[PDB]
Amino acid sequence: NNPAIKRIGNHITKSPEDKREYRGLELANGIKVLLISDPTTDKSSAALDVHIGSLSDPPNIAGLSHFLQHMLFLGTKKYPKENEYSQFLSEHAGSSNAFTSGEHTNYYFDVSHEHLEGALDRFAQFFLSPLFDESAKDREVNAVDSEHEKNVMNDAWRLFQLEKATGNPKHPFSKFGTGNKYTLETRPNQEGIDVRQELLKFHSAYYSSNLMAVVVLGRESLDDLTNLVVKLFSEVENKNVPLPEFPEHPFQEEHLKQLYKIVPIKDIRNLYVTFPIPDLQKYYKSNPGHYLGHLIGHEGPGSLLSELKSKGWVNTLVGGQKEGARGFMFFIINVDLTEEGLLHVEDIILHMFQYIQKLRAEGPQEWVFQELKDLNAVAFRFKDKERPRGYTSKIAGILHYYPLEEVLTAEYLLEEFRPDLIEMVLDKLRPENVRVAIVSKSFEGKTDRTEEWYGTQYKQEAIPDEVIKKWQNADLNGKFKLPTKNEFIPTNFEILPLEKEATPYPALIKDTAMSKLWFKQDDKFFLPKANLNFEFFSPFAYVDPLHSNMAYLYLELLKDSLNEYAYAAELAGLSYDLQNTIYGMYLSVKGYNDKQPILLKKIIEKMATFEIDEKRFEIIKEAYMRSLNNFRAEQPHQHAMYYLRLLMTEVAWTKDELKEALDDVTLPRLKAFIPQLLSRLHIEALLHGNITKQAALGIMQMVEDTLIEHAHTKPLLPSQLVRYREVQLPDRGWFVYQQRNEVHNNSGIEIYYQTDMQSTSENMFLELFAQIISEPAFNTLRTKEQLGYIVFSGPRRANGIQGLRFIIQSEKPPHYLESRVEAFLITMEKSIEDMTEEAFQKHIQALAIRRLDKPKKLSAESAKYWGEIISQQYNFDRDNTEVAYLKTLTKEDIIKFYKEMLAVDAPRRHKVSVHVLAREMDNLSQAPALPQPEVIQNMTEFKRGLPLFPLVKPH
């Protein structure tokens, strides 16, 4: 025994199928710990979660804990080099991040498995003696102000904060968590607060070992991992902080029976119905909140959603419990609104209470709870192996909530059925304690109020007594049934043994004109699951905007009517993904392989025989029109990427083209479109998982067979199977296209340096440079220069071509950004000229580990395969060859490559830039001198004006 370890944990109950090894323990200083031994993980990781967050922010420095979280990255006592942490991880294949919630601050990284000790050390420092450097402070406040800027114009954020501001103002729930330049610098200097000191005050006052939980995952044996923690974490001061409670609800008497009418930024139509509840956390083992959310939120036959959709009022509904803090929670039912529904809100709400009435009126259904228990049991048994970074972070978070033995199980397994709790909570959901909110453009100019932080335009009203009274008397309504028994529960979990000639990569087990079929039997994960992917090709999916519009609408309407049936299957771990592409349709079925054939069949059947409902079509069209219009309000950086895809792709219809070609889409024209669409196809498919060559062929045949019979589908000519090309930029060219964002007062910019077609050598030149410049880019342009919160670099891949991209969202104009990125590029050339021999070999090694990181779940592997497939390159052994070639690459090579391709005066520099200007608009290293750019005036003229690349060769 060790007096540095208050206690060791016994078995950590894990999934039967879980090959990782677990030991939890409580350290002497009070810290809870979980150790995970996975002898074969090639990324190790750790997280720590402090049970403190912005709900504890000083009333007069809003944002302190978010800000603190940003700061702990920027240097410590033994690692005072500002970017030592993030540079280390860059050089050793790791990545890192953090988040701050009401009651939590969570920090996590991953790294190449040998470099665990090193990364973990630097990490452990954040919680011992962070520098809180004074000039790092003044800079990093801008990143926070930038985080907030980004969200000011976001509808979910405005609403998130509007709730806080409509409950008790004295309650710490009203607090503004993010902080910004004002709260974190300005109001402080005015009030003569010293902010560095407050960071220390707070860090010392609250980052106590008794409020911490730590999770670490490596190859190291459980005993080694124990040493490693104790060596690095026993040293954390235990200030014995009491953990905050908020036993009073933010919503009190006066805050109920209220109605809020709110102007959104987007053109969205929403109803937010919300009830206050006691903290249901403690009842976690019976979980009455989940039970009720499951019925209220049900989508199948007889469900509340189903009736509201039938009256053509709402399309989607979410319900169930929402977290609050220790001491309080919420129960929510939220719907969107058709133009009709918006006119019918009082009614929709009555219908909610009607449903609630049905439930009250026949009380807690054990069969239901039992179904839920059983399903969780299975979900848990066959859980996919998580990625380390996510797993450590997740775990470290729930370590504060469940005994060490039951962390792995708590959030999955339900236990005993508690009718009394079910009824306790249910009894809390009645007209007298309701808050109602409506979100509509129709309140424009009719609101008398402004939320102070987001500026949200709104109006408040007591809900008249006549209206509450009328909901209290809600009767029963024959249209509301409990769900029926879940037909889809998987039962057959047998893992079919690996076939005699089963291959390591996907085999091409079929090649007719009508279909190309790729198959691989799962040889790694042995879980009762399969992935079934399918590109369908038709010229008519994308021939013109009117036709894109119809392709899209067809699949939406299809999905919309399949929904009641598919929901059940979803709950039972069987799901589908169906959407239109530029080449045709994509369809994917993932999950337990057992009922997979039933669902697939129903889809193809339901699709080749689909009849449209008048009302649905009208409703979905109106939603899709808004959707297209709503792009106006997306983030500047997203706009930049959007225009770049438009500029660089051979054919690509624009949201504008689509929006105005949509009035033309009529019911008749759609009916005509579908058999027209289905009449001629090619199918490409990957079927990866727990099935056999014969089963696979069988599944394919079944798919084909249904199309031939219901849709009269016959094959496509090889010649008509066309990929799109990328525009070929001239040697030494510089084009800039530029637009204004009408919503966000912040600008955006993508810069594209195009290099050449993908090939083993070109791929790897690009990827290595991207790797070398990766953290430097972030460091100079964000940490140092503070251009904005969003700063990104690294590779662009499309239509078989590639190159280097930079993305930045910022307060500065693009004309300015351009120079700084350019300036940075020189700094980066000198940096490599000088960089040490094995500094370089570290970067090769870091790239290598990234690329050869093995998939941890089936679907991770399937994506890797699909990538090769839909991209037409079919290069399944890619990583091994490209990494083997990565290694003979010399610092020499990278320089010639930079000089030839990317340098401002490279003979072969191909450059395009998209400048999205803020709502408003028109020291440092040496920026170079830049040519007059050609100013793209018209993307059609642009594209017509230059060559197109070849398409890439298959393998």
Binding site: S54, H66, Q69, H70, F73, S96, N97, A98, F99, T100, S101, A143, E147, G177, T178, H290, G293, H294, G297, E299, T316, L317, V318, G319, G320, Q321, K322, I332
Partner: peptide, 8 residues
């Protein structure tokens, strides 16, 4: 459906 500040 049943119901479900960073850096980088």
């Amino acid at each position: 459906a049943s119901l479900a500040s960073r850096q980088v």
